C-alpha cells in the first residue's frame, strides 16, 4: 500500500479499514422499466497516516460497484482528503495520497454477500470511473486543524493543480481524463491541463437525457447537493444533463467559491482478477462511530490527537 522509504520500519504507521460491502440503491437513478437493472454495492475506505502518536493526514474514499450480468461499472469517489499539520511536513503529501488512492481504485478483494431472493462472484470485466471534486476548505476531516503551524492550506487553483498532478499519475493509460470548472470559460479551464496531453474539458457521464439518470449523487458533493435539490423539488423529469451543468455554475458553492472543480477519469473494459487481500473490515456502525469520534477531536491539540490515536490502537 506504501513504499518503505515512507513507512521507514515503524517511524510511520497506518490506519486503514473498509466497511463490509453493503447493497444500496443506485446513486444513478435507473427507471423501473430499464433493461438489465444492476445491483449496487458500496464500500467505504478510511485511511490515515500516523507519525508516532499523531495523525498526519487522512483520506476517505467510497467505492460503488454497479454489478451487471457480465461487467461492473465501478465508481471510485474521493470523499475527503485532509492534513493535520501539527508537525513539520517530512513527506510530500502527494507521495502518500497517490499510492493509497491507487490501491483503493485497484482493490478487488471485496467479500460481497449474495443478494436476497456464500459470497457473490463479480464479473471480471470492470469499467472504472474516478470522481473527485476540488473545493478549498480549511478543514475537511480534522476539526480545528486550520490554525496549526504546519498545515499548508492551498487556494483553489493550487488545490486543483495538485489534484490534477496526483490523478494523472495514477490513471496512466485511462480512456479519458476530464476537467470541468463550472462558471469558468474554456481557455481558463484549458490552462490547468495544457501540460497534460490526455486531459480534456468536460465530464465523464452520459451527455444526453435527464441529469438524474446520468450523474451519480455522491454524499457531500457539489453536484450531489444540486441533484438533491432537483429531486426534492421533483424536477428530476425535466432537468437535462446539459442544463444541470449549466445551472450548477450559478450555485452559491461555485459562484462564491474558489475555483471549485470537478474531475472525472474513465478506464473501459479492464479485465480484473479477484484477489483476497486481508484488510480490516468493520460494520457501518463501527465506521460511523470512528468518524463521529474523529469529528469531536480538537486537532490543534496534541493531547486529544494522541488520545484518539492510542484509543484506536486499543481496539
Curated annotation (Swiss-Prot):
Taxonomy, superkingdom: Eukaryota
Modified residues (N6-acetyllysine): 223
Disruption phenotype: Leads to a decreased pathogenicity in mice and increased susceptibility to killing by macrophages in vitro.
Keyword Cytoplasm attributed: no
EC number: 2.3.1.48
Domain Rtt109-type HAT: residue ranges: 1-315
GO MF entry, a single one: histone H3K56 acetyltransferase activity
Reactions catalysed: L-lysyl-[histone] + acetyl-CoA = N(6)-acetyl-L-lysyl-[histone] + CoA + H(+)
Single GO biological process annotation from the record: regulation of DNA-templated transcription
Protein name in UniProt: Histone acetyltransferase RTT109
Gene behind the chain: RTT109
Subcellular location: Nucleus
Similarity annotation: Belongs to the RTT109 family.
InterPro entries associated with the record: HAT_RTT109-like, Histone_AcTrfase_Rtt109/CBP, Rtt109
Binding site for acetyl-CoA: 133, 137, 152-154, 162
Any one GO cellular component localisation term in the record: nucleus
Active site, renumbered: 221 (proton donor/acceptor)
Function, in words: Histone chaperone-dependent acetylase that modifies 'Lys-56' of histone H3 (H3K56ac), to promote genomic stability, DNA repair and transcriptional regulation during mitotic S-phase. Plays an important role in the regulation of white-opaque genotoxin induced-switching.
Coiled coil regions in record: none
Alphabetical keyword list: Acetylation, DNA damage, Nucleus, Transcription, Transcription regulation, Transferase, Virulence
Principal subcellular localisation of the protein: nucleus
Matches recorded under PANTHER family: ALTERED INHERITANCE OF MITOCHONDRIA PROTEIN 6, HISTONE ACETYLTRANSFERASE RTT109
